[PDB]
Design a protein around this motif. Structure first.
Motif, PDB file in Angstrom:
ATOM      1  N   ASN A   1      33.553 -85.235 -27.780  1.00  0.00           N
ATOM      2  CA  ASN A   1      33.231 -83.817 -27.890  1.00  0.00           C
ATOM      3  C   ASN A   1      34.159 -82.967 -27.021  1.00  0.00           C
ATOM      4  OD1 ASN A   1      31.402 -81.446 -26.603  1.00  0.00           O
ATOM      5  ND2 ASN A   1      30.895 -81.754 -28.770  1.00  0.00           N
ATOM      6  N   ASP A   2      34.491 -83.453 -25.819  1.00  0.00           N
ATOM      7  CA  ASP A   2      35.404 -82.718 -24.944  1.00  0.00           C
ATOM      8  C   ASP A   2      36.741 -82.454 -25.622  1.00  0.00           C
ATOM      9  OD1 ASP A   2      33.485 -82.596 -23.023  1.00  0.00           O
ATOM     10  OD2 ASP A   2      34.383 -84.050 -21.655  1.00  0.00           O
ATOM     11  N   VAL A   3      37.295 -83.446 -26.326  1.00  0.00           N
ATOM     12  CA  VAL A   3      38.558 -83.207 -27.025  1.00  0.00           C
ATOM     13  C   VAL A   3      38.371 -82.170 -28.127  1.00  0.00           C
ATOM     14  CG1 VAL A   3      40.318 -84.242 -28.480  1.00  0.00           C
ATOM     15  CG2 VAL A   3      39.572 -85.431 -26.417  1.00  0.00           C
TER      16      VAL A   3
ATOM     17  N   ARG B   1      37.910 -73.969 -27.778  1.00  0.00           N
ATOM     18  CA  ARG B   1      36.845 -72.981 -27.674  1.00  0.00           C
ATOM     19  C   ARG B   1      36.350 -72.858 -26.237  1.00  0.00           C
ATOM     20  NH1 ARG B   1      31.598 -74.158 -28.066  1.00  0.00           N
ATOM     21  NH2 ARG B   1      32.020 -76.107 -29.218  1.00  0.00           N
ATOM     22  N   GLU B   2      36.195 -73.984 -25.536  1.00  0.00           N
ATOM     23  CA  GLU B   2      35.730 -73.918 -24.153  1.00  0.00           C
ATOM     24  C   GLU B   2      36.793 -73.365 -23.218  1.00  0.00           C
ATOM     25  OE1 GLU B   2      34.314 -77.823 -23.299  1.00  0.00           O
ATOM     26  OE2 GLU B   2      32.307 -77.348 -24.073  1.00  0.00           O
ATOM     27  N   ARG B   3      38.069 -73.625 -23.508  1.00  0.00           N
ATOM     28  CA  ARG B   3      39.146 -73.025 -22.728  1.00  0.00           C
ATOM     29  C   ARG B   3      39.053 -71.504 -22.762  1.00  0.00           C
ATOM     30  NH1 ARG B   3      43.796 -70.574 -24.067  1.00  0.00           N
ATOM     31  NH2 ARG B   3      43.411 -70.993 -26.294  1.00  0.00           N
TER      32      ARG B   3
ATOM     33  N   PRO C   1      34.326 -74.805 -17.349  1.00  0.00           N
ATOM     34  CA  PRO C   1      34.925 -75.962 -16.667  1.00  0.00           C
ATOM     35  C   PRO C   1      34.277 -77.302 -16.994  1.00  0.00           C
ATOM     36  CG  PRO C   1      33.471 -74.828 -15.148  1.00  0.00           C
ATOM     37  CD  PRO C   1      33.428 -74.041 -16.463  1.00  0.00           C
ATOM     38  N   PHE C   2      33.148 -77.327 -17.709  1.00  0.00           N
ATOM     39  CA  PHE C   2      32.456 -78.583 -18.031  1.00  0.00           C
ATOM     40  C   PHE C   2      33.180 -79.270 -19.186  1.00  0.00           C
ATOM     41  CE2 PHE C   2      28.315 -78.704 -15.773  1.00  0.00           C
ATOM     42  CZ  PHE C   2      28.360 -77.467 -15.164  1.00  0.00           C
ATOM     43  N   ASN C   3      34.292 -79.920 -18.868  1.00  0.00           N
ATOM     44  CA  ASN C   3      35.068 -80.579 -19.913  1.00  0.00           C
ATOM     45  C   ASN C   3      36.020 -81.542 -19.227  1.00  0.00           C
ATOM     46  OD1 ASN C   3      37.212 -81.174 -21.814  1.00  0.00           O
ATOM     47  ND2 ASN C   3      36.357 -79.576 -23.136  1.00  0.00           N
TER      48      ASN C   3
HETATM   49 MG   LIG Z   1      31.331 -79.088 -22.253  1.00  0.00          MG
END
Ligand SMILES: [Mg+2]
Ligand SMILES: CC(C)=CCC/C(C)=C/CSP(=O)(O)OP(=O)(O)O
Ligand SMILES: [Mg+2]
Length: 429
Positions: free
Chosen positions: A306-308, A313-315, A320-322
């Motif tokens: 999921n992190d990849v 989108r999270e960037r 920071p949770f990645n």
């Molecule tokens: Mg995350």
């Protein structure tokens, strides 16, 4: 449908997620092209910060899609009416697709209950996501609501819990940790002090639907303590995330990120309910330290995949949770593409650790009944692992996934066209 019909549709309209038939053909294609050729490296093609992310997720388990996906998809509007939601948000979460692909061989109601559990995580997660905002824009009243909601949700699960064995009541009671002062042991049950039932949370209908299903389907005949335990682990994990995000100082190491993701990935709740749908079942597995570690490896693998997929989108959220960003913060030589490669490698090592634990757990079984129970429970987690990979692979229609992948839409449309044409060509052989 026949391969010739779907080929004609794909050539004219491409692949979609709004025709639920297409997903059966996508999953069938993935099994024939990868698994069936001994190739367990599934492609992921996306971008992060303009960098090409072109990697493969390793997972050696058999792909499949629930036969109930058609009916689940066909009843999605009535399912969504339970939720406080726009359809735009419901469509991106797409719990019909998630459950059908991670829980492929269950009854309709045992597949739907998994959809509900994953959607609960997604809706609570998006309520917690208010804390991602810059401190200027954070509204304390929304945080008050969130903190109150998860306590009331927790009590709703407590209210269906009446274990047959007193040691199981104590297991949950001792596990409440910082929530324990809000509850008391009455009736042989754990009950929230009615002082604190101060609102109706926005997704109470969902949580009541879950509790009613577990109460009516499993509590009469099965020990449901692990379902309760995993929900407590999840709710406490959400509170931990509120604390970390509320602090605006993210200092988690990768090991601490792993420990945190072990609590909030939500798949252990889905597994706990699915475990109850099988006659082969060992409740004692849940306190076996090796089996507990196997569950943690499973949550971390899903997390890293999921992190990849969610990195871009999270960037933009500045989230920071990645693991991709944790690794970049530790190592200044990594760009996003190189960091994604390290994460994919970590996920490979965790998959190998999962497989090592599996062999150890099965060898330690005392008798045939326990061996078959443990093998069934481990198979259930394997289903989730390949299911999650194919879930991200098959994000081919914008609006019907959390992270739409236009390069996968193009790649899968090109590759499945050739595979269907070969099917038609050799027909009827
Ligand atoms: Mg995350
Ligand atoms: C859908 C299934 C089966 C499992 C995936 C669970 C999972 C890893 C969700 C991500 S939680 P989080 O990273 O906080 O959420 P986003 O920022 O990606 O919106
Ligand atoms: Mg994510």
């Amino acid at each position: 449908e026949s391969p010739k019909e779907v080929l004609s549709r794909v050539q004219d309209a491409g692949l979609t997620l709004t025709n639920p038939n297409d997903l059966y053909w996508m999953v069938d294609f993935l099994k024939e092209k990868y698994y069936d050729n001994g190739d367990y490296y599934y492609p992921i093609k996306t971008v992060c910060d303009g960098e090409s992310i072109d990697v493969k997720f390793y997972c050696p388990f058999e792909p499949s899609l629930s036969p109930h996906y058609l009916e689940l998809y066909g009843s999605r509007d009535e399912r969504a009416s339970i939720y406080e939601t726009t359809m735009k948000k419901y469509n991106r979460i797409n719990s019909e697709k998630t459950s059908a692909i991670c829980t492929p061989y269950s009854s309709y109601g045992d597949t739907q209950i998994v959809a509900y559990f994953y959607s609960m995580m997604y809706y609570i997660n998006d309520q917690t996501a208010h804390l991602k905002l810059p401190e200027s824009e954070i509204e304390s009243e929304l945080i008050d609501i969130l903190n109150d909601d998860i306590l009331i949700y927790l009590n709703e699960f407590m209210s269906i819990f009446e274990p047959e064995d007193a040691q199981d009541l104590e297991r949950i009671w001792d596990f409440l940790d910082f929530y324990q002062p809000y509850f008391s042991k009455v009736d042989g049950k754990i009950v929230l002090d009615e002082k604190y039932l101060v609102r109706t949370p926005s997704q109470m209908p969902l949580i009541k639907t879950i509790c009613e299903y577990v109460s009516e389907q499993f509590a009469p005949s099965k020990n449901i303590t692990q379902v309760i335990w995993e929900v407590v682990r999840y709710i406490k994990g959400v509170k931990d995330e509120i604390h970390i995000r509320g602090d605006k100082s993210f200092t988690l190491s990768l090991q601490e990120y792993d420990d945190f993701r072990d609590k909030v990935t939500a798949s252990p709740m889905a597994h706990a309910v699915s475990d109850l749908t099988h006659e082969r079942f060992s409740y004692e597995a849940y306190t076996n330290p090796a089996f507990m570690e196997l569950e943690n490896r499973c949550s971390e693998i899903i997390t890293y995949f999921n992190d990849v997929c969610t990195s871009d989108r999270e960037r933009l959220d500045e989230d920071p949770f990645n693991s991709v960003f944790i690794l970049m913060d530790l190592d200044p030589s990594l760009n996003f593409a190189k960091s994604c490669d390290v994460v994919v490698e970590h996920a490979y090592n965790k998959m190998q650790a999962f497989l090592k634990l599996k062999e150890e757990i099965l060898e330690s079984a005392s008798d045939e009944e326990e061996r078959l129970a443990l093998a069934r429970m481990i198979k259930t987690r394997e289903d989730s692992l390949i299911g999650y990979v194919l879930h991200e692979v098959c994000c081919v229609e914008d609006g019907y996934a959390r992270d739409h992948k236009p390069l996968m839409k193009a790649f899968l449309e090109e590759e499945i066209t050739k595979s269907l044409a070969e099917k038609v060509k050799f027909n009827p052989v």
